[PDB]
Amino acid sequence: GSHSMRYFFTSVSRPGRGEPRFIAVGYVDDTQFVRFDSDAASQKMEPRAPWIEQEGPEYWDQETRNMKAHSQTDRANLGTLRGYYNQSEDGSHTIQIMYGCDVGPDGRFLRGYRQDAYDGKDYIALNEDLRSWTAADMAAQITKRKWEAVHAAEQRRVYLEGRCVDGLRRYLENGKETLQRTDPPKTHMTHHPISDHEATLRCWALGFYPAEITLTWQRDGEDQTQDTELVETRPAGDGTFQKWAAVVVPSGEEQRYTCHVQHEGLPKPLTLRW
């Protein structure tokens, strides 16, 4: 299947309370593999997946340099944006950045991304063509003009089509025993009387990977979409995911209902009946 690598960065100003908090995380697909935290003791990029630990000292040194540089740029940028917007020094502000690339099953480049936000709203984004920018407001237009003058877009494209792709490809091979696996959901149904005349049926999917899954309820074969409560997909804490769907049914009618579970790790979709 297709794969992705993403880095997510958050810097938050802390007026009166020292330097901004900087937190960086890297992902391959739904799996986190590196982190940097400015308040942590190491002051290094750190491994968060087994398969990255075998990268040598020069990898860790370089990634650490990259994080310090990102940190420092964000710090100056918090000041810059505060000036563009005429904001009070008293307020806490946030810069977030995401970038990364997607590859197909043959490792070929599908698309790249680079997007910046200020205080949780779009600020400036690289367009899909990897040659132009979308600025969200008048302040971001200043940045757009600057990044045009310094040919930032070409620099991003070089990264996104090159090292982003090369890195992801190496990671997918090195961590193939986990990144290229699919853990099918462990499924079961539970039953919870609400009264003598009603019960909840809950259809569970646990321990699955990757995160994408569909759970659907039927009554006599017909989808019950509107009546179905679906929780948001949630991390188990061990690298796998969880989800459930529930329906409220008339007591005595539980056996008319079925739950269908679809996941790429299943030989065939599963059907459950009380």
């Binding site: 990102h70 940028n77 944006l81 940045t143 600057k146 982003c164």
Partner: peptide, 9 residues
């Protein structure tokens, strides 16, 4: 691997 390039706003 992260992008070594940073840019001021």
């Amino acid at each position: 691997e992260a992008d070594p390039t940073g840019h001021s706003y």
